[PDB]
Amino acid sequence: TAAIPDEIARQIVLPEGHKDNVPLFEAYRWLRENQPLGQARVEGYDPLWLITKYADLMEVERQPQIFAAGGGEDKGSNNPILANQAGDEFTRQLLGGNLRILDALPYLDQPEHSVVKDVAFDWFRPANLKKWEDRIRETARASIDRLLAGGPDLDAVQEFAVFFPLRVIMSLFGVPEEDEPRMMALTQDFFGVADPDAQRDDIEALSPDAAAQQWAATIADFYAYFDVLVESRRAEPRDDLATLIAVAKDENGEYFPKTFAYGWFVAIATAGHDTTASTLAGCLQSLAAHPEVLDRVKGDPDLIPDLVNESLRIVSPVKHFTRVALQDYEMRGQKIKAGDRLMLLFQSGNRDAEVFDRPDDFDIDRRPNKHIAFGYGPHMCIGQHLAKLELKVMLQELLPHLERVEVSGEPKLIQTNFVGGLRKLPVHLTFS
Ligand code: HEM
Ligand SMILES: Cc1ccc(Cl)cc1
């Protein structure tokens, strides 16, 4: 019944707790082993049930009529992306009483979620992505040509991994190549709201609501950019993903409001590349630690999808979304009360020893690989098949050219409790 101990709670709730993976994963492990379903009561945050167990993540996510993302019929009464209390107060001041700062899928509950998701559901199915595989492969091969030309010593993140997924999504999306640097900068602002090295110059960095102010400022910049793109594609439809979203109409023949397009565009322009970049960089870091795995996958390229799956499980770059209980609910001997918030810890589910043998080991021979890096339930990642295709294609093209990865300097993570992973991985590569 007791609250989670304060230092374990702070490790997971506070963005600074995520600066180093070792203490963070040890806190997730302490909970799974000693307090798998407890309430974190961190000063400055709402109380949060920390959902650390794989089975519990599925139990919550498969019951959206009980555990809402956006607050159910009181739309925007829950923030699906954990802000501190001061930050939610800033957003309620800006929006006028609620937290629905994007019309993107994470903010929506059924049935609205279902209607909006159906705009793009088919586009993102694996069979409908096959038509992009050759373009993706040409993009990978161009990126690998630049890697070979630049020599063996680089930051495998900022000087390699970041560019391929960004170019892929901007090409599919229809954003011109010259706009990639702006999209990259706004993505760093968006996922860096609590990172000391990613602060915007136009917000008060030290204010209690700084992250929320940065989130809002970044969204306003994306809206200004995507307003021009929506109007452009409505006036002159093209055969690109921007057009599918920009021209989408509801069951009465009316365009969805423009902010629904903007919400798709924010999600695709941020999570659509950053997560894949993180997983690719994390894969390279794991091949440096486990050179026998690199040798084995160069020996059998059909192991590449297994390597992608184990990279996704280990890196798990999307750390959480929040839910709110719409009714009291008993789980694992605990009484969740109506109105209580939950934090879904996908990275912790991915280390649950009840599901994975030697869960901290990098083991590509987990078949099936039961990871939950894409979440579960109706909100399960829409982009998962595009991410798996891009990582497969890049590894098919890159690994033949790599004999060895060495980490030659200190890795750096984004300091975030939300969408994290490496921002720097200094390497020495041995090529062929
Ligand atoms: C390695 C790559 C990725 C990982 C690990 C990842 C992970 C996730 C996770 C854990 C969620 C939350 C699921 C839940 O609430 O149960 C999610 C949601 C989402 N992701 Fe992905 N993602 C990746 C790639 C992508 C890509 C490539 C796109 C788009 C092109 C994308 C778009 C989205 C969107 C729109 C949502 C919200 C879905 C909803 O709330 O219904 N993601 N992702
Ligand atoms: C993973 C993720 C999906 C959608 C948004 Cl808006 C942000 C992050």
Total number of domains constituting the chain? 1
Pocket flag, ligand 1, residue 247 (CB < 6 Å): no
Query: In whole angstroms, how far apart are CA 306 and each of 31, 46, 280, 329, 346?
Result: 29, 39, 14, 37, 19
| Sole residue written with tokens 């600074």 | 16
Q: 226, 103 in Cβ contact below 8 A?
A: no
Of 260, 270, 279, the residue with max ligand 2 atoms within 8 A of its CB, to mutate for a pocket test, comes to 270
- Output phi, psi for 48, to 5 deg: -135, 125
Phi, psi of 49 (to 5 degrees): -70, 125
Q: What is the Cα–Cα distance from 255 to 245, expressed in whole angstroms?
A: 10
Q: Which of 380, 340, 346 is nearest to 67 (CA)?
A: 340
Write out the residue range of the structural domain in which residue 47 sits. 1-432
Q: Say if strands 67-68 and 37-40 run parallel, antiparallel, or are unpaired.
A: unpaired
Q: Are the C-beta atoms of residues 307 and 12 closer than 8 Å to each other? A: no
Q: For the CA atoms of 145, 150, 156, 161, what is the dihedral angle to 10 degrees?
A: -30
Rounded distance between C-alpha atoms, residue 39 and residue 6, angstroms: 10
Nearest CA, atom 40, ligand 1: 106
Q: What's the gap in Å between 424 CA and the centre of ligand 2?
A: 22
Q: Which two tokens stand for residue 112?
A: 């609205």
**β-strands 341-344, 48-51: how paired?**
parallel
Is 147 within 8 Å of 156 (Cβ atoms)?
no
How many Å lie between the centroid of ligand 2 and the Cα of residue 324?
18
Instruction: Determine whether the shortest distance from the Cβ of 69 to ligand 2 is under 6 A.
Output: no
The coordinates were experimentally obtained by: X-ray
The data reach a resolution, in angstroms, of: 1.4
Is residue 416 within 8 Å of 194, Cβ to Cβ?
Answer: yes
C-alpha 338 chain-centroid distance? 28
Amino acid identity of 196? P
Radius of gyration of the chain (CA): 21
| Ligand 1 near 61 CB (within 6 A) | yes
Q: How far apart are CA 257 and CA 385, in angstroms?
A: 27
> Residue 266 CA: which ligand 2 atom is closest?
6
Q: Which of 161, 384, 134 is nearest to 287 (CA)?
A: 161
Length of the chain counted residue by residue = 432
> Does any ligand 2 atom lie closer than 6 A to the CB of residue 104?
yes
DSSP letter for each residue of 28-65 = HHHHHHH-SEEEE--TTS--EEEE-SHHHHHHHHT-TT
Bridge pairing between strands 322-325 and 341-344: antiparallel
Which residues, at least 6 apart from 12, have a Cβ–Cβ distance to it below 8 Å? 24, 27, 28, 31, 40, 50, 343, 345, 417
For residues 61 and 377, is the Cβ–Cβ distance under 8 A? yes
- Pocket lining: 267 vs ligand 2, CB cutoff 6 Å: yes
Q: Is 383 in the pocket of ligand 1 (CB under 6 A)?
A: yes
What spacing in Å lies between the alpha carbon of 271 and ligand 2's midpoint?
Answer: 5
Q: Is the dihedral of CA 207, 213, 217, 219 positive or negative?
A: positive
One-letter amino acid for residue 87 of the chain: G
> Coil, strand, or helix at residue 308?
helix
* Ligand 2 contacts CB of residue 101 (under 6 A): no
Q: How far is the centre of ligand 2, averaged over its atoms, from the C-alpha of 294 (Å)?
A: 31
